[PDB]
Structure 1
Amino acid sequence: AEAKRLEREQKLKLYQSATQAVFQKRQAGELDESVLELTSQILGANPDFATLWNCRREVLQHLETEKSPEESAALVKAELGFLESCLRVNPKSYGTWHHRCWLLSRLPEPNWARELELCARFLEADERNFHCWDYRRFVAAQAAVAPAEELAFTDSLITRNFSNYSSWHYRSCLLPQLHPQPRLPENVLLKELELVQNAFFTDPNDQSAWFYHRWLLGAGSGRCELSVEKSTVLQSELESCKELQELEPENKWCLLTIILLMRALDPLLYEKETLQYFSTLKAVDPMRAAYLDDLRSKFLLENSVLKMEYA
C-alpha cells in the first residue's frame, strides 16, 4: 500500500522534471539527442502524451539537416526500435502508430515486408486491434500489395480461430476491389456464402459470420431473378438453419437469418412462416423486441406492395 504509493510518487517527480526539462529545452531551441533521451523516459509509460511525439519529430527533422547520411540512418533505426518497444507496452496509442507512419513515409526506401510482419505479430496477440489493422492497410498501400494477397491473409486468419469480425470486415473491402465496378458477381457471392455458412455452423456463436452473411444476402444482383443454383443454395441454407435451431434453441442469430432467407426467397409464399418466426425470435431475444417489430412492420408493408402489384 505505502511502498506502492511511494513508488509512483517517485515516478511522478521524475516524470514531472523530465517533462519540465523537455519544455525548457524546446523553448530554448535545443533540438538535440537529449530531448530524445528525455522523451523516451516519458513516452515509455505515457505514449498518449502527443506533444512529445511532436517534439521527437522536430528533433529528427533538425538532426536530418545537421548529421551525415548514415548518422541519420542510425537515428531512424533507433526510432523504429523505440517505437516497437512503446507498442509492446500500449499497442492502442494513436500517437505511437502515427509516429511510425510518419517515420516510414519519410524513408526512401523502407522495408515494407518487415512492417507487414510486425502487423502479423501484433494481430496474433490481438486480432481485433484496429490500430494495427489500420497500419496494415497503410503498409499494404505503400508496398502496393495486391488485394488477392491480402485476401489470402484473411483466409488463413478466419481459419486459425474465431475472433474474427475484423477479418470479415477486411474481406468485405477486398472483394469489391478484386471484382470492381462503377454488388458482387454471383460466382464470388456463392463462394462467400459457402465460406460464411461453414463458419456459423462450425461455431453458431460466431456473431461476425452472421453479420457478414446478412450483407452477402443483400449483395446479390438482383433477385428474385434468382438462378437455379442460388435458389437451391439459399433453400439449403434455410434447412440448415432450421436444423441449427433444433440444436441451439437459444440462438437468436439463426432465427433472424431464417427470416432473412425467406425474404430473399419469396416473401409472399413464406408470409405465414415469417410471422411465426418473428414471435419466436422476440421471445428468445426480448431486448431486440422493438427492432423486430419495426422490421416486421417494414416487411408487412413490402408484402402489401407486392400483393397490390397484382395483376
Structure 2
Amino acid sequence: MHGRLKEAKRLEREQKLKLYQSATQAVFQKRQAGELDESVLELTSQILGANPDFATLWNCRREVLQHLETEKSPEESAALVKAELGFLESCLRVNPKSYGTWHHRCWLLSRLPEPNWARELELCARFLEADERNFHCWDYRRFVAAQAAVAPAEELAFTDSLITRNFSNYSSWHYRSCLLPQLHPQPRLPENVLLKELELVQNAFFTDPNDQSAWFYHRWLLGAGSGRCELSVEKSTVLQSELESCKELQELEPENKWCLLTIILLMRALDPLLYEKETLQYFSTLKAVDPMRAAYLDDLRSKFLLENSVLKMEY
C-alpha cells in the first residue's frame, strides 16, 4: 500500500473487518453452494466499494451476471446491466485507479448488443479532467475509441484541447505520438506534419519551460524527422530558429537543464562537426546544472565524439 501517512477509529475498523469478514464468508459459501443470485451482488457491492482489488469478487459478479442472463427475461437482464454500470461508476469515483474495476467495465460493455459508446467517451473525458495522467482511463478511452471506430483525427483534436488548457501533459503527448503515425501511415513522420508538431511543442515548452513532457516529445520529433541531414531550407531554418530560442530561454532560466540538452541535440541535428566546439561547451554547463545525470551525459558525449570521428574519416 501507498501514501499511508504515519480507539473510536481503531474499533470502527474492528467493526468494518468483522462485517467484511462475514460478508466475505457468506459470498464463498453461496458460491460453493452454486447459488448464483442477486444476493451475491448485494454482498460483493459492500466489499468491492472499499476493496476493488479483491479480484475474485469481480469474478463472482461476472459468474452471477452470466448465470442470470440465462434465466431472466431480456428486460430483466437489461436492468441488471444498467445497475452494473451505475455500480461501476460509483466504484470508479472512490478508486479511479483499480485494474479490476476498469476491466469489469470493459468485460461488461464488450458483451452488450447494444453499447452506448458515446456515453463511455464522455465518462473518459470527465475522469480525465479530474486526473489527466490516469493511464487506466486513457487505456479505456483507447478501447472505447476502437470499438466505436472513432477516427485518429477526432482523437487528435481531443489531445490539442487537453494540452493547451493545462499542464500535466505527458499522457496527452504520448497519445499524440501514437495517433500521428496513423493519420500519415507507412509500413518517421512526413515533413509538413513534423513542422506543425514542432511548432506546437515549441509553444508548449516556451509557455512552461518546466514542463518535462514537451521536451521528451520534442526529442522524439527531432529523430522522427529526420532524415537526415538532407535538411530542407525550411527545416534547416526552423531548427536554427529553435536553437536561438533555446539560447534566449537559457538566459531566462539558467537552472533549466532541458533547454541545454535540447541545444546540444539541435546542434547534432544541424551539423555535428561545425558545432563540435559549442557542443563540448554545452556538455560542461549541462553537467554542472544537472550533476545527477553526469554519467549519462559523459556517455552521450562519448557517443557523439565517436560519431564525429566517423564523419571526419569519411572526408
TM-score normalised by structure 2 residue count: 0.98
Q: Distance in 2 between matches of 1:161 and 1:221?
A: 29
Structure 1 residues 271-299: Cα deviation after superposition (integer angstroms, max 9, x where no partner): 00000000000000000000000000000
Question: Structure 1 residue aligned with 2:272, among 259, 264, 267?
Answer: 267
Number of residue equivalences? 309
Q: Which string of whole-angstrom CA distances, capped at 9 and with x for unpartnered residues, describes residues 182-229 of structure 1?
A: 100000000000000000000000100000000000001411100000
Q: Deviations over 1:97-153 (max 9, x none)?
A: 000000000001100000000000000000000000000000000000000000000
8 A contact 1:207–1:253 mirrored in 2: yes
Rounded to whole Å, the distance in 2 between the matches of 1:45 and 1:221 is 51
**Alpha-carbon distance between aligned partners in 2 of 1:35 and 1:48, rounded to the nearest angstrom:** 17
Cα gap change, 1:278/1:221 in structure 2, threshold over 3 Å: closer, same or farther? closer
Q: Which residue of 2 aligns with 1:239?
A: 244
* Superposed counterparts of 1:102-181, under 5 Å: 102-181=107-186
Question: In the aligned structure 1, how far is the partner of 2:154 from the partner of 2:49?
Answer: 35
* Aligned residue in 2 for 1:6: 11
User: Does the CA-based 8 Å contact 1:214-1:257 persist in structure 2?
Assistant: yes
Contact map agreement 1:127 1:163 (CA 8 A) in 2: yes
Residue in structure 2 matched with residue 47 of structure 1 by the alignment: 52
Distance apart, 1:33 and its partner CA: 0.2
Partner secondary structure for residue 221 of structure 2: helix
- How far does the alpha carbon of each residue in 1:84-105 deviate from its partner, in whole angstroms, 9 at most, with x for none? 0000000000000000000000
Q: CA deviation at 1:233?
A: 0.1
| 2:196 pairs with 1:191 | yes
> Contact 1:185/1:221 (CA < 8 Å) preserved in 2?
no
Query: 1:17-64: CA deviations, max 9, x gaps?
Result: 000000000000000000000000100100000000000000000000
Aligned counterparts of 2:234 and 2:227: Cα–Cα separation in 1: 14
Partners of 2:49 and 2:296 in 1: how far apart? 46
Distance in 2 between the 1:221 and 1:280 partners? Answer: 27
Q: Is the 8 A contact 1:183 1:220 kept in 2?
A: yes
- Deviation of 1:76 after TM superposition, in Å, equals 0.0
Change (3 A) 1:133 1:255: same
CA contact (8 A) 1:189 1:216 kept: yes
Paired with 1:272 and 1:150, the residues of 2 have a C-alpha distance of 43
CA–CA separation in structure 2 for the residues paired with 1:104 and 1:121: 18
Identity of aligned residues (%): 100
Instruction: Tell whether the 8 Å contact from 1:224 to 1:265 is kept in structure 2 after alignment.
Output: yes
For 2:52 and 2:300, the matched residues in 1 are separated by 45
In structure 1, runs of 5+ residues without a counterpart are: none
- Residues in 1 aligned to 2:225 and 2:172: alpha-carbon distance in whole angstroms: 21
Q: Deviations 1:154-194 (Å, cap 9, x if unpaired)?
A: 00000110100000000000000000001000000000000
Corresponding residue of 1:93 = 98
CA distance in 1, matches of 2:49, 2:198: 46
Supply the distance in 2 between the matched residues of 1:21 and 1:109 (Cα, whole angstroms): 34
Tell me how far apart the structure 1 counterparts of residues 158 and 312 of structure 2 sit (CA, whole Å): 47
Say if 1:200 and 1:206, in contact at 8 Å, map to a contact too.
yes
Does the aligned pair in 2 maintain the 1:31–1:59 contact within 8 Å?
yes
Distance 2:92 2:229 in 1: 50
Could you say what secondary structure the match of 2:219 adopts? helix
Q: TM-score, structure 1 length as denominator?
A: 0.99
Distance 1:85 1:124 in 2: 17
RMSD: 0.4
Contact 1:36 1:56 in 2 (8 A): yes
The whole-number CA distance in structure 1 between the counterparts of 2:130 and 2:232 is 43
* 3-state DSSP of counterpart to 1:44: helix
1:63 partner SS: helix
Structure 1 runs (4+) deviating above 2 angstroms are none
